[PDB]
Amino acid sequence: SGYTPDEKLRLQQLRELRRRWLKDQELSPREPVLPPRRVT
């Protein structure tokens, strides 16, 4: 049983792509750029 070599390689490539995407989901320190304006 186990992974075939093609399955292993495809899983590895998909894994590195997914980890890149997940890391890209993080917010930078300034990311919620909020525009301010007021009228016991």
């Binding site: 989901q25 993080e26 917010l27 990311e31």
Partner: protein
């Protein structure tokens, strides 16, 4: 922790804009109407029932109580 993540969600801009517009127009007419009704009730309203004087025929709107209804 600096693990703030982006939340994927649909755009709430259009729903908020519609709700603000609807509230604005409803209030645009309703606030003056409420103020006018309150002023009429406080300063004018509440007619009292009386007996028709002999020989006097009232107007068709004189058979009603509320000033706005009259």
């Amino acid at each position: 922790h600096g693990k703030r993540l982006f939340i994927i969600k649909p755009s709430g801009f259009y729903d908020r804009r519609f709700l603000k517009l609807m509230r604005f127009y409803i209030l645009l007419t309703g606030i003056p109407v409420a103020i006018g009704i309150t002023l009429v009730n406080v300063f004018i309203g509440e007619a009292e029932l009386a007996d028709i004087p002999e020989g006097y025929v009232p107007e068709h709107w004189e058979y009603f109580k509320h000033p706005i209804s009259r």
